[PDB]
Design a protein around this ligand. Structure first.
Ligand SMILES: *SCCOc1ccc(CCNC[C@H](O)c2ccc(O)c(O)c2)cc1OC
Ligand code: NA
Ligand code: NA
Lengths: 454, 120
């Protein structure tokens, strides 16, 4: 029909929204073992019984884990079996024929979910759909046990039955490009933002201080992040797949772990730096020189390199479970599978250790400020808001991820992958917030103004 | 929007003693560095003496042993004892306050400046 826009009128795209794609065996809202896209394996409470039925369906030993090719093949087999079930029934076909293309799909949806004989149970609802009494059948279907158990999916199917359009599912496409344009802005803010910082310290001589030498490091880790990590990361999420190969999958992963670790550990260095620069400024100016500070930065990148490129390129970070082995064998799969060891080891070094130091240091700052050689002034209240933003932002961005990252492995995943990738991006945008936190100095202000002549 | 009141500068004979003063009127963050800077005729602005809010001090290599900096107990007023003055100490002494309320950086306050002349 000359239709190559994104969304179309079909049962296939409809079910994919209702039933997510999961390669490993899981349990539905009922509790039955299911794999792929809503493919029921068995009602048997035994997982081994589900594995046997699964291996008899695929034709090989799957270990409860299949591939995308096998998932799609089962999906079309199930949809075809749903349609062939509708056509072979006495109650379904008289209704199915008398339905438009859209409403036909809505009927297949129910059959895809609760079987041929189950949907035929709806004597009243089907008669009403047959006499084109949509609004009455919409109300009647909302009184079934199918509605009480899966109210979200039912409400969408019932709506499609009512309107006769894809209004309940077409709202998914707006969010597709809707989050794409957001990612498009995130990349720009990080790249252009950190380049501005680096350019300022590199050009102007007044911005060449020890603290700013640490700022340069932070701006460097965030820049590469916005040039390597963030773009390639978004490029896959939108396209649903990874189209660069296995070699660049881990290399891009290596850059990720590298830059993120270097970024957070630098935030830690800056925090300690500003402690000594304030608490003991006279010793701070004498002890810590540019040479010494260059050694500190070098140490940070080595630690970051030791916890990123070193384990990854040596396949040490790799997990062993069947779903991980497949992705390591797949050229289109670049998921981040790790073992308990690397997941904890990285998190402690990348996030937790700097987190502890940054909190303890900034606490001492608020502590040793009360004990000085000195009555309810507002200069201390404003300074309190500052550290609340510095530390609060870093917390609100990375903490949700690394907590989940540690829960992601302590037990078999009860936390959705959708949440896992989302919380990584909340950490990703911290690399954009940094220049808006660590470059508000009057010297940076004047530098930023002249760098673009505003 | 705070103020700095300088006082003390004047004419003295070579070797004579002089006392400077700088009252910091306004609200300053607890952690700070008050001190003094000078501009000798035909020379860049140099650090004379500076005292942190934590009592510790710092002097230049050309004044250490002759100049003694100190501060009041609660009035935020820094006094600069200047003894055994030299004709090369003749300069424009500015008052200075390093605020740390921004944590990441340090905002600077300055004074009107005082003229100190030593008759060679
Ligand atoms: S669409 C292909 C898959 O997309 C994808 C897969 C994996 C990841 C993980 C990216 N983040 C790694 C994380 O930042 C991290 C940094 C540092 C350490 O130490 C650890 O442990 C994790 C992301 C995406 O898409 C974004
Ligand atoms: Na096409
Ligand atoms: Na791979």
């Amino acid at each position: 029909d000359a239709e190559n826009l994104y969304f179309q009128g079909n049962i296939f795209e409809m079910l994919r929204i209702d039933e997510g794609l999961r390669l490993k065996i899981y349990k539905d809202t009922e509790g039955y073992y299911t794999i792929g896209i809503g493919h029921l394996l068995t009602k048997s409470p035994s997982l081994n019984a589900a594995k046997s039925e699964l291996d008899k369906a695929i034709g090989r030993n799957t270990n409860g884990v299949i591939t995308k090719d096998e998932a799609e093949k089962l999906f079309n087999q199930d949809v075809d079996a749903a349609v062939r079930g509708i056509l072979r029934n006495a109650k379904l076909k008289p209704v199915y024929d008398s339905l438009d293309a859209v409403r036909r799909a809505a009927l297949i949806n129910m059959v895809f979910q609760m079987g041929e004989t189950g949907v035929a149970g709806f004597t009243n609802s089907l008669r009403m759909l047959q006499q084109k009494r949509w609004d009455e059948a919409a109300v009647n279907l909302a009184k079934s046990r199918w509605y009480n158990q899966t109210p979200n999916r039912a409400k969408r199917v019932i709506t499609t039955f009512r309107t006769g359009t894809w209004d309940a599912y077409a709202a998914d496409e707006v969010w597709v490009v809707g989050m794409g344009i957001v990612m498009s802005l995130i990349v720009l803010a990080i790249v252009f933002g950190n380049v501005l910082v680096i350019t300022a310290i590199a050009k102007f001589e007044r911005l060449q201080t020890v603290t700013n030498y640490f700022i340069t490091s932070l701006a460097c880790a965030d820049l590469v992040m916005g040039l390597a990590v963030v773009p390639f990361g978004a490029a896959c999420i939108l396209t649903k797949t990874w189209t660069f190969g296995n070699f660049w999958c881990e290399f891009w992963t290596s850059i990720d772990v590298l830059c993120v670790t270097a970024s957070i550990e630098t935030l830690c260095v800056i925090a300690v730096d500003r402690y000594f620069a304030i608490t003991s400024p006279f010793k701070y100016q004498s002890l810590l020189t540019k040479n010494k500070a260059r050694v500190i930065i070098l140490m940070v990148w080595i630690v970051s390199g030791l916890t990123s490129f070193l384990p990854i390129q040596m396949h040490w970070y790799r997990a062993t479970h069947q779903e991980a082995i497949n992705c390591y064998a797949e050229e289109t799969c670049c998921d981040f599978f790790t073992n308990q060891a690397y997941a904890i080891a990285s998190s402690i070094v990348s996030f937790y250790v700097p987190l502890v130091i940054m909190v303890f240091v900034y606490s001492r700052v608020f502590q040793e400020a009360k004990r000085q050689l000195q009555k309810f002034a507002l200069k201390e209240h404003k300074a309190l808001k500052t550290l609340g933003i510095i530390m609060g932002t870093f917390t609100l961005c990375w903490l949700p991820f690394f907590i989940v990252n540690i829960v992601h492995v302590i037990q078999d995943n009860l936390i959705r992958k959708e949440v896992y990738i989302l919380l990584n991006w909340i950490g990703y945008v911290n690399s954009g917030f940094n220049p808006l936190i660590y470059c508000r100095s009057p010297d940076f202000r004047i530098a930023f103004q002249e760098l673009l002549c505003l | 929007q705070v103020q700095l009141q300088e006082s003390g500068g004047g004419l003295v004979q070579a070797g004579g003693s002089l006392r400077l003063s700088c009252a910091a009127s306004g609200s300053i963050f607890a952690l700070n560095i008050m001190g003094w800077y000078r501009q000798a005729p035909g020379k860049q602005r140099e650090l004379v003496a500076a005292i942190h809010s934590g009592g510790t001090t710092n002097y230049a290599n050309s004044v250490k042993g002759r100049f003694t900096i100190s501060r009041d107990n609660a009035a935020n007023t820094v006094y600069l004892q200047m003894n055994s003055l030299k004709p090369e100490d003749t300069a424009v002494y500015y008052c200075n306050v390093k605020d740390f309320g921004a944590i990441i950086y340090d905002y600077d306050y300055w004074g009107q400046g005082t003229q100190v002349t030593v008759s060679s």
